């Protein structure tokens, strides 16, 4: 099979930027590469096929070039409606194979998260489980590092995160991390801390509580 390598995985750009998205094939695919645009919850839309041919109706700011193993999709000047995920797909042989995608998001200024920690509720403790939550609010860029500490012991494997998509008004992200402990383990320890590393922070920020306070 042909393996398609797409770069970058992610790009934050501004309206008006020239955007360059690349796809490399593991072996030659001649001139036959297609490009698709996909918006969240929607099907992919065809933009370009055979490397450089625009599908009728596709705006002229989209263009494609390349041959053999190396190909490019260009958006000459980014528009608001262009923020989206783009995929390449070789059509030189079977099986048909796709790149892993390039997500194009809105560039804005660095913003440090506001950090908050929440203890488990007394009601939950009655069920025999403790969930401890850490919120990282309204930050940019998306990359950030949450480390859980229990009585200063670094936690591993017992937390899960999720992240919102860019806020429609301020283009920031928010993230919650949840540490899950048994009631017994929770009650064996005093200090619960969420330590946050981010580009906007000159040193890691720690938010903590004491069990029972």
């Amino acid at each position: 099979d042909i393996q398609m390598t797409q770069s970058p995985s992610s790009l934050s750009a501004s309206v008006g930027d020239r955007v360059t998205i690349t796809c490399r094939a593991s072996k030659t695919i001649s001139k036959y590469l297609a490009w698709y645009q996909q918006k969240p919850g929607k099907a992919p839309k065809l933009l370009i096929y055979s490397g450089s041919t625009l599908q009728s109706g596709v705006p002229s700011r989209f263009s494609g070039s390349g041959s053999g193993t190396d190909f490019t999709l260009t958006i000459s000047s980014l528009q608001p409606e262009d923020f989206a995920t783009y995929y390449c797909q070789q059509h030189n042989e079977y099986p048909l194979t796709f790149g892993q995608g390039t997500k194009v998001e809105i560039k804005r200024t660095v913003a440090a998260p506001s950090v908050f920690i929440f203890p488990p509720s007394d009601e939950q403790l009655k069920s025999g489980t403790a969930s401890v939550v850490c919120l990282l609010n309204n930050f940019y860029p998306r990359e950030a590092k949450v480390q859980w500490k229990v009585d200063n012991a670094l936690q591993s494997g017992n937390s899960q995160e999720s992240v919102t998509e860019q806020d429609s008004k301020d283009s920031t992200y928010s993230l919650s991390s949840t540490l899950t402990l048994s009631k017994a383990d929770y009650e064996k320890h005093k200090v619960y801390a969420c330590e946050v590393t981010h580009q906007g922070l000159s040193s890691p920020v720690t938010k903590s509580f004491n069990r029972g306070e």
Binding site: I29, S30, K31, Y32, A34, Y36, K42, A43, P44, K45, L46, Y49, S50, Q55, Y87, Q89, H91, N92, E93, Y94, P95, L96, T97, F98, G99, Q100, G101, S114, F116, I117, F118, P119, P120, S121, E123, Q124, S127, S131, V133, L135, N137, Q160, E161, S162, V163, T164, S174, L175, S176, T178, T180, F209
Partner: protein, 214 residues
């Protein structure tokens, strides 16, 4: 005009099976190859295989040949995907897509809306809702919507009176096979004495509704 509509998606247990349908209208059905393409949540695209409605000639992606059967009923303008012995990795949105097989091999000019297939051994269950209490000039509170299946739940605040600064996070699939999600909101610290905060949680698949004061 070309219209493609998938149906048949939903929940299935590991080791189960499902038949998906794609109704293709608005053009000559027997004139173009039809395709199935699948896309796991978060991920990119995988081509399943293709069929020509005229004579039911097929070509499969090798990886799918054992467990997936593509068929067609040209009299009904309908394409099918029979998926057998299902497993967690089969969880994906499944698209039917019309092929242009002309320049080299195939690219896809029209797509359906997609139908979601979710493979799970969990059992239908409404959530427990727990407060994320504001700590003793901006404060954060929220609710933890824990241990429900299947997706989705909805969360509002103060019956929709509170919308500014709300973040409701994507659900996380826990190791138990049940989902959890948090919804948070930032508010004026001054308000915590005076203003009431209630999260309104709905889980339609179990007909569960919960209001929790925070």
């Amino acid at each position: 005009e070309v219209q493609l509509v998938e149906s048949g998606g939903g929940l299935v247990q590991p080791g189960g099976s499902l038949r998906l349908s794609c109704a293709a209208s608005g053009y000559s059905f027997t004139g173009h190859w039809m395709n199935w393409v699948r896309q796991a949540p978060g991920k990119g695209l995988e081509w399943v295989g293709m069929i020509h409605p005229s004579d039911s000639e097929t070509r499969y992606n090798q990886k799918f040949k054992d467990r997936f059967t593509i068929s067609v009923d040209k009299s009904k303008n309908t394409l099918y995907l029979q998926m057998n012995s299902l497993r967690a990795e089969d969880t994906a949105v499944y698209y039917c897509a019309r092929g242009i097989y002309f320049y080299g091999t195939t690219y896809f000019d029209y797509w359906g809306q997609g139908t979601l297939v979710t493979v799970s051994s969990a059992s239908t269950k409404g959530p427990s809702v727990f407060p994320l209490a504001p700590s003793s000039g901006t404060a954060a509170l929220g609710c933890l919507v824990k241990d429900y299946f299947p997706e989705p739940v909805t969360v509002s605040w103060n019956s929709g009176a509170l919308t500014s600064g709300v973040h409701t996070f994507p659900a996380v699939l826990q190791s138990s096979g049940l989902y959890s999600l948090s919804s948070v909101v930032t508010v004026p610290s001054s308000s915590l004495g005076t203003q009431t905060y209630i999260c309104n949680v709905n889980h339609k698949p179990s007909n569960t509704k919960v209001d929790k004061k925070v």
